[PDB]
Each structure stands twice: as structure tokens, then as C-alpha cells.
Write a protein that binds this ligand. Structure first.
Ligand SMILES: [Cu+2]
Ligand SMILES: [Cu+2]
Ligand SMILES: [Zn+2]
Ligand SMILES: [Zn+2]
Lengths: 151, 151
């Protein structure tokens, strides 16, 4: 696809709508999330578009290259690693990202996978431990959605 | 993918989990639905995995080859026309479909689009009006979900 979309729901106050658009070989991710506690939350494309167990069955991060966990800019990162999104004091987060690694077709295509917002900030793989190299220690999954074709 | 999955939700009693698997040049589609009234209900793949306005934003049937609506057997159908599932007296429909037209990859991939279960029976394009040739007069979209990649 050239355009896709994601509606984030959970069993909490955290809702959002994430928009995806293919520009050459980057994905412009745009949107907002509401209900967040102030500050950073990890923002990851997890592997499966599977909601049979809420956000739990989305699996780990989309990582077809078997890299370590990392931030959007690091060479060592999962493809699904889109780093942190920041909520203001009103709990709202404008999403604004241009990523050349995730995509909306071919392999690395995120279509039909799961966009997750996390309870905790992502330490971007740079942490005193080994969960850091897996999840960035972004903690729980607050809200998630299957990324579907929009246009 | 070679497997996908779909959680049917709406604002209603109706809910279901639909399982797709690539089997040779066919997709076998299995699962169950509940909450329905008895007898036949249309069961279609709609074009957009766009859940922003619930099932409404899914759009029309997946129809990349611009054919008029039909039943899954017809020369002339949409790729999304999987026909009817039948609810027994207890509101329960056991899904069991193998289709040669829909795919989990390539052109015709149904990953990222929407599975919809309708209010009324599809008429397979054999009503006598425009609504037959587009919709099957299947009625309102009771429950839908986005088709995601499954382990
Ligand atoms: Cu994550
Ligand atoms: Cu339909
Ligand atoms: Zn990661
Ligand atoms: Zn149709």
C-alpha cells in the first residue's frame, strides 16, 4: 500500500489514530494519541496483527533482520523501532516521524502488524541491563492496533 | 504472510475470530462467529483496513479488477465476496471457506483489509437492482475487523 492507518485501543484511557504514507522509501508516520501520562512512551511496531489476546499476542518487535533493540536512528535496531512519542501535560501526543526502515510494502512491510504505545519511555537499547536490548524497557502495552490499508 | 487472523468486533453482541491460512493456491478460512440472528449473513472482505469510523470506513468490497458483485463461485464477483455464513438457532456460525481468489500475499492479498459480517443474506448478485450488483443487499455491517499477520 501507499497509505495505511491504525486505531490504538486498549483497556485504558489511551486512544489514538496513526497515519502512514509512503514517500519514496520512507514512511511518514503522523497522528495523535490521547490519555498518556506526561512525557515519553515507547512506540514500536510489534510483529503480528493478532488481537485475540489484546496487545499481548502482537508478539515482540518486528525484527526481520535479527538486530538488537535500538532507536529510529541507530543502525542496530529492530525495523519496528520508532522510539519515543511525547505526551504533554494534557496527556496528548502528536506523532510525527519519517522513517526509512519500516515500509508499507514488500518485506519490512508493516501492513497487518501491530502498532504499540508503551507505558514507559524507551531507553533506546542503552540501558544497564538486557531487557533493554529487547524491549527498551518500555514496559506495558497501553494501547495497540492492527495497521490496515487506508488508500 | 501464510497465516492471518481477524477479530470481529462491532458495537453489538456479534463477535468472532477468523483464521486464514494459505493452502496451495487457496486460502482456507476457518473460525466461528456468535451474536447473529439465525440463517444467512453476508461475509465479505472490504477494501480498507480503516477502523476510524468503525465498520463504515472499511469501504466497499475488495474489488481490484472492477467486477460486479457475485457469489464466491461466480465468474463475476469481487475478490472480497466470500458469500454467506449461516447462524444456527443459537446465533452461532461455524466458518469454513476455501477460496481460490483471495490471497495472503501478492496482488489480491487480504492482509490489512477488513472482514465484515453483514446483517442479512448476500443475494449473490441475484436481486433485481443496483444494490444486488454491488452489495448483495447484505445490509448493515454488524461486526468487522482488520486482517492481521498471524504466527
Ligand atoms: Cu514495543
Ligand atoms: Cu460486504
Ligand atoms: Zn525494538
Ligand atoms: Zn461484493
Amino acid at each position: 500500500a501507499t497509505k495505511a492507518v491504525c486505531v490504538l485501543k486498549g483497556d485504558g484511557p489511551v486512544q489514538g489514530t496513526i497515519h502512514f504514507e509512503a514517500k519514496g522509501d520512507t514512511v511518514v508516520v503522523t497522528g495523535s494519541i490521547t490519555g498518556l501520562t506526561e512525557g515519553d512512551h515507547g512506540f514500536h511496531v510489534h510483529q503480528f496483527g493478532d488481537n485475540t489476546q489484546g496487545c499481548t499476542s502482537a508478539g515482540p518487535h518486528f525484527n526481520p533482520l535479527s538486530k538488537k533493540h535500538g532507536g529510529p536512528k541507530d543502525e542496530e535496531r529492530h525495523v519496528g523501532d520508532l522510539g519515543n512519542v511525547t505526551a504533554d501535560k494534557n496527556g496528548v501526543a502528536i506523532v510525527d516521524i519519517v522513517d526509512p526502515l519500516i515500509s508499507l510494502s514488500g518485506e519490512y512491510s508493516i501492513i497487518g502488524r501491530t502498532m504499540v504505545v508503551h507505558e514507559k519511555p524507551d531507553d533506546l537499547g542503552r540501558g544497564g541491563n538486557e531487557e533493554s536490548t529487547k524491549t527498551g524497557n518500555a514496559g506495558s502495552r497501553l494501547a495497540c492496533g492492527v495497521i490496515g490499508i487506508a488508500k
